[PDB]
């Protein structure tokens, strides 16, 4: 039947890019699935939000046999 | 919808109660679960009652 509907934009995406200094707890990426996976010092929330578990620099990296994206936190 | 609100009351004597829903048709038996009672500060058995 008729169209006309759409939902509110969920403001997902990368909140802190590579090199950015973050304090423990800071959301690095809001995503729907695990487009990025949690690496060293990075936690994964119930809505697959990746967050900092320790103060430091955001590091993006491709690891493993499945060539997956990982967000980690390097000490600064 | 076809699911009703029910209260789980503390057996510890304290007025404390948890609140949940129940499908009264499919599951007619009274719901029993061990839950934390913040008045006695211990895990006691809780039993279903009407909301």
């Amino acid at each position: 039947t008729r169209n006309g509907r759409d939902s509110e934009a969920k403001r997902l995406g990368v909140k802190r890019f590579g090199g950015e200094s973050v304090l423990a707890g800071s959301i690095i990426v809001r995503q729907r699935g695990t487009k990025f996976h949690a690496g060293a010092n990075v936690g994964c929330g119930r809505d697959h939000t990746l967050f900092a578990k320790a103060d430091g620099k955001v590091k993006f990296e491709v690891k493993g046999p499945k060539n997956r994206k990982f967000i980690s936190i390097e000490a600064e | 919808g076809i699911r009703e609100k029910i209260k789980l009351v503390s057996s510890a004597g304290t007025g404390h109660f948890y609140t949940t829903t129940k499908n009264k048709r499919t599951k007619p038996e009274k719901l029993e679960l061990k839950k934390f009672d913040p008045v006695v500060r211990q895990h006691v058995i809780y039993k279903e009652a009407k909301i």
Binding site: - | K5, T19, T20, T21, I51
Partner: protein, 64 residues
């Protein structure tokens, strides 16, 4: 004549030490079973009135 206070406003806001206003959170009156314990727990303590809303509150409470 004396300015009259917005009596309903004076029943919801209270002036704090540094000039601000404290208020109770919305969404904790009824329909509480579906609401998560976490959500309800954060809604219990009083809160401060935001920057955008102080002008409105101050206009309603000239004797605050």
């Amino acid at each position: 004549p004396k300015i009259k206070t917005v009596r309903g406003a004076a029943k919801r806001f209270k002036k704090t030490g540094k000039g601000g206003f404290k208020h109770k959170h919305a969404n904790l009156r009824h329909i509480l079973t579906k609401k998560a314990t976490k959500r309800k727990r954060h809604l219990r303590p009083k809160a401060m009135v935001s920057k955008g809303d102080l002008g409105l509150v101050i206009a309603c409470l000239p004797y605050a």
